[PDB]
C-alpha cells in the first residue's frame, strides 16, 4: 500500500489517537488526521482524500459501529477500509462488526507489529 495513504484515526480519547498515530508513523504512514467521535469523523471526511479509517467502538454522539455503517452505506465512501478497535474481543461485538462490513478488528492494547499485521491483511484482501 502507498506510504502516503491518508488515515483518519477516530477515538474519543486524545491519548489513544496520539498512540495510534505514532504507531502508524513507526510503520511509515505519516499522512494521518484525527477525529474525536463519529460525527467529528464524518465532518472531517468531507475534506476528501481519505484512504483508510481506524475507529474506536465506544464514542459519544456517534459510536464506531454507527460510523462504520454510515460509511458503508454512503455513496462516495462505501469501500473505504475501516479497521475497528475494541476493548475486548467478545463474540457479539465481533459479529456486529462483521455484519456491518468492518475491514478488520483489533483489541486494545496492541503493538505496532500487530497493527502492521492487521493493516497488511486488509491491504491484501483489497488488492492494495
Amino acid at each position: 500500500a502507498d506510504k502516503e495513504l491518508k488515515f483518519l484515526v477516530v477515538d474519543d480519547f486524545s491519548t489513544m489517537r496520539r498512540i495510534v498515530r505514532n504507531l502508524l508513523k513507526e510503520l511509515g504512514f505519516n499522512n494521518v488526521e484525527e477525529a474525536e467521535d463519529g460525527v467529528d469523523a464524518l465532518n472531517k471526511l468531507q475534506a476528501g482524500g481519505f484512504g483508510f479509517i481506524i475507529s474506536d467502538w465506544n464514542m459519544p454522539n456517534m459510536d464506531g459501529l454507527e460510523l462504520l455503517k454510515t460509511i458503508r452505506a454512503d455513496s462516495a465512501m462505501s469501500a473505504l477500509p475501516v479497521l475497528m478497535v475494541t476493548a475486548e474481543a467478545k463474540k457479539e461485538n465481533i459479529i456486529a462488526a462483521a455484519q456491518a462490513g468492518a475491514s478488520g478488528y483489533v483489541v486494545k492494547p496492541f503493538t505496532a507489529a500487530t497493527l502492521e499485521e492487521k493493516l497488511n491483511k486488509i491491504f491484501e484482501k483489497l488488492g492494495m
Binding site: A89, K90, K91, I94, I95, A97, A98, A102, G104, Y105, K118, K121, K125
Partner: peptide, 11 residues
C-alpha cells in the same frame, strides 16, 4: 470460538 471466529472472518 473467538480467535477461531476471527479467522473465519479474515480478521
Amino acid at each position: 470460538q473467538v480467535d477461531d471466529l476471527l479467522d473465519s472472518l479474515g480478521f
